[PDB]
């Protein structure tokens, strides 16, 4: 049989499909096969180009500094509304109900119970003072739900599930849902139309984002970020690594952004655990954190409560509703534009050291999903993003002069001054900042990249990187050329709609571009 | 003072701090996909609407042919590719390489004659026509094999992929087509059964040519959503063969970024830029175009790929030439399924209902939203009555990556047009190209860039004038890797890989530590960063498996037992991090499994208990994943109590037959068995021998022997 | 177990599908048969593992006599259940039993690890006895090279490696030794002697 | 039967709720 | 039996009993 060879012949339908799937100008695949096997092109490309219209071209235009303009001018316009606070939890306003504890780790329900027990005035408060009901939520629903939360937390039983199970159903709006019918009736009925897409609002630059950026990037006497031990370091390289790691954690641990990140991670871990354990029953979840002071006292901090709805979901993209009540010391009337989504009370006051300050409860309904729910416990990677780059920075310095500089860049030595970056500005005057402060700024930038992250943020960053690299090329006098600048600008600015971090990133980008323009004179 | 993170770039280059720009820590965007699929179909036909519009007489679906069509007169994307220019580029590539086409085609044919049908089980989810859904590749292949048995189709039992492709091509001619369909019969309960269903020839052709669609939700750095298409099993063999051929061709091509991955790609990038810097004339300029192609698959006609396949196999057996040309034919007449349909609701009655796609036009268009109104008013011409869109021109993303890369490299390699005083060369990989143009001044550099752009427009390639820019050589980006002054920062994007691998304790730990060490080797992760990554990973690993340090006062079910073990055993430095032991891993010993690492520090009782030869937590069938961790990553672990498996979330026929064969011939689970005889007789002979040996050794009683032999005789083998 | 094997074979053959497939597919074709699994791979291993660790009995224990060593509930803590299983046909268990086994239970043999995992212990030996020196912080010139990640006792091509492995630990199914066992006879005998006396 | 439910308007019936929620809701009149 | 209140937008109804005619 070796004189035959393989046999693989095409049938009728496939042969016909081949016959009709030949480029234009042919009438059979045998014709195309013969044409390809025989005809020889000896400049067909040039013949086609010699006739193609001269109205097609990359439009190569050299790019100068003047062409670059601020991105998203509409944020400056004051006619648009101030951007609201849409993050899951309060960041720079959290009020920590702090109880000193020997160190024992206890269930969150018992911890919240004890924390409220210490503060009897707030635990037993039952007559609210509505400061503002935002637009739609009902004050009665939210207040009764919060009272049920407090009663459940303070109840003797270890169970942490709502004892009402019926009032919450309407407080959370679970019952306010449409009922699905079959396709036939929808076809027959004339009033069953299609909802128009809901585009995000076009907002302006707020002010709370800048203040939170400043405040979360400052040292605090309280530290929460703790990390597990590792094995003894015997090689010199791991000794250097340990020194660098210590110098970094001594800086990051005491910034408030670290505490906020740990609070987010713990809350999302607890939310995932409750959802997996409890599926179709409303649950109560304290927003717990653990904070060690410089003296080693392991305070447990209760930041509020949250009602979890019915999470019985087979898929991951399915949404589960949760309502958050948050203790805070900020009266929203100081800036009502930051809190258009929040219905708040005034549940009392407290003394931290003798200076009485009010205590309000911010109540808001929200919704999450298993994806964001998991990413909450993966938000710790911000820390890594904060170290990598700084590591590189330090390594670059080490490349210059032989010895190790991690003490020099941070604190300086007798031979090298402490390393200072450009961090902020005031009255048009840019200000420097220590190495630790720059590390804090980067860590807070990563944390915000997470918390305010959505499709808009991705579309903004991945498309403004084009302008970032173009500016980098210009600063090196590579004379970069561009093909369609307005196209890139439109692509970038079609993402600055309502994300507070996106709007502030656009604002800072414009300010920094102005600074680079003014400094390019040299 | 007002802080500003962007000011970091005042004192640092962007490339150095590029990692912070990307928001690869937040929640990636996630999602109906019917709107996106309809929009993709609309755009694909719009770009080629000027071609030749005809009606397929094999399927009855409208087809648009842009090839050899009018030359575009505008910058808008064009799928009008001239065949002669494609053949010219292929001929230039052939001249520039010694018989590369022949060698690649011959090697593809040889490896094809050795390929088995079961290779089609790999990959991702595939469209199944017996149910018209998306099912795992293995299940879809099994179902199609089962269905073919009914209509007098065979070749799967014959082994190799040649008979399977032959009888697949035969199936397109059978006047009917019988198969098993799922019937969710009401009994109230919904019980699924198998119902012998039949479909005609036209319906079967449409089903085979249909391309199922889904939303590409996993994307990270794109605001607007794209739709990914999954094809049926009847195209997988041909697409696989053509892709292997294109890979063979492109691997030799120094201009191709694929299929090499990792530090190899960086090596290629740096070598190419160094080469171009060397080749520059005296005082001339070598400009680099950072390009990011768009509509890379909505402009590539499958007819051009058919022509490329025919030209590539210029000298090869006629049977192979016909076989490898089937995939372009199937793709040139493909059909696209359309999501799950739009949803219409009335708020005055709190009513909502999803409208299946087949009923798209059963409703007055005045009820859809204006945008979907226009979409349907434009999609009507190509809409099939069954609820599918006729999508002949263009390609869906991910099918011909290698072939499209080869076409791009063909465009790159022309290297000159009209003998103008310039040259060009570059790197191309699956929708990402970086070009280098050398000349004696900037003006000639852009003359060359424009010429290359025009030449690309003659093949259906349309470089994005909005996502691309040009600068001086020595600073650019390729596939998210940044090159600047010789410094290639591996953009730190492997951050979302430090979570537990979710396979088991020891395996998860080994995978995590190997990931850390590989990142240190490749991405330049600093020693402090690696130590902190070890710390964070150990924290997450302890939390996820509810096993913290025994000393710590944390409460838990397993935590109480860990506490007990903490003092019930003296040697406290030998416990595992899964047993509340102290972490011992550091940079110097990320390459050693901890079980061997702590072997000395353990206690005799502890090591005896943990490393027992037999563990009810360890099973033979659980060993499948001991080699590769799902990308198949190799990890080193140690057999022990912590090597367990999680609970599960003609099927039984094949499954239990294979399981029993493995249990009989324990060597089968490791290496492919060999034999030209029925499985039954092999098992019968082996079991007879084993029974005799068990008795002769006293391990089996006489009544047991007689029962076994009676059963074997009943089997008909004694 | 061989009687259990024959009884399982008879029960499987009682169905006609098993009879027709077994008598149809040759031994060589078995590979294809094995690859027709569900492939319903978990979409997100992290979430699955997180959920499973919180379940009462996520561990899938193989049916056997080991369970009798441990009660179904020890010190008021549930360990294992007698409910039947469909995915694996065994029993269910919890990490509590695993931790108890690491704490108490049968004590195994420590000999096998001296030689079975020779490569890992050689890695540890090379690490422990290594001598470290200074650190040069200056820039380092690096070249991309094709390097062998791990040392090998005797490098051989994959097919010869598989044949040698079978000749070592699979005394049966060793038809017609090729022109590869004589080359590696020393390795064959060394590994055979070293691995003898194990139960892994 | 399913179609007649919406054809006859029987399916367009308001939903009863507990008096507590109704008193606590200010939009119910 | 009291009275009956209703929200048309939400399509909800509830009965206010006689003892709760002033709440």
Author numbering:
A (entry chain A): 195 to 716
B (entry chain B): 1 to 31, 34 to 189, 201 to 643, 652 to 670, 684 to 752
C (entry chain C): 1 to 200
D (entry chain X): 359 to 387
E (entry chain Y): 353 to 375
Please give the exact wording used by the authors of the publication that reports this structure.
In the nucleus of the infected cell, influenza polymerase (FluPol) uses the viral genomic RNA (vRNA) as template to perform synthesis of either capped and polyadenylated viral mRNA (transcription), or unmodified anti-genomic copies (complementary or cRNA), which then serve as the template for vRNA synthesis (replication). ANP32 is required for both vRNA to cRNA and cRNA to vRNA replication. ANP32 comprises a folded, N-terminal leucine-rich repeat (LRR) domain followed by a Glu-, Asp-rich intrinsically disordered region known as the low complexity acidic region (LCAR). First, it stabilises the formation of the replication complex, an asymmetric FluPol dimer comprising a replicase, which is part of a parental RNP and synthesises the genome copy and an encapsidase, a newly synthesised apo-FluPol, which binds the 5’ end of the nascent RNA replicate to nucleate formation of a progeny RNP.
A minority of particles are apo-FluPolB trimers, whose overall structure was determined at 3.57 Å resolution. These particles comprise the FluB replication complex, which is similar to that of FluA, with an additional third polymerase forming a FluPolB symmetrical dimer interface with the replicase. Further refinement focussed on the replicase or hANP32A-encapsidase moieties improved the map quality and estimated resolution to 3.3 Å, enabling relatively complete models to be built. The overall architecture of the FluB replication complex is similar to that of FluA, with most domains in the equivalent location, albeit with a few significant differences. In the FluPolB replicase there is a rotation of ~15° of the PA-ENDO(R) towards the PB2-627(R) domain when compared to the FluA replication complex, allowing the FluPolB PA-ENDO(R) 63–73 insertion to contact the PB2-627(R) domain in the region of W575, a contact not observed in FluPolA replicase. Interestingly, there is unambiguous density for the FluPolB encapsidase PB1-C/PB2-N helical bundle swung away from its normal position. This structural element, together with residues 194-198 at the tip of the PB1(E) β-ribbon, makes a significant new interface with the top of the PB2-CBD(R) (residues 466-474), which considerably reinforces the replicase-encapsidase interface. No equivalent interaction is observed in the FluA replication complex. This extra contact largely accounts for the fact that the total buried surface between the replicase and encapsidase in the FluB replication complex is ~ 5100 Å2, considerably more than the ~3300 Å2 for FluA. Human ANP32A binds in the same position and orientation to the FluPolB encapsidase as in its FluPolA counterpart, but due to sequence divergence the interactions are not necessarily conserved.
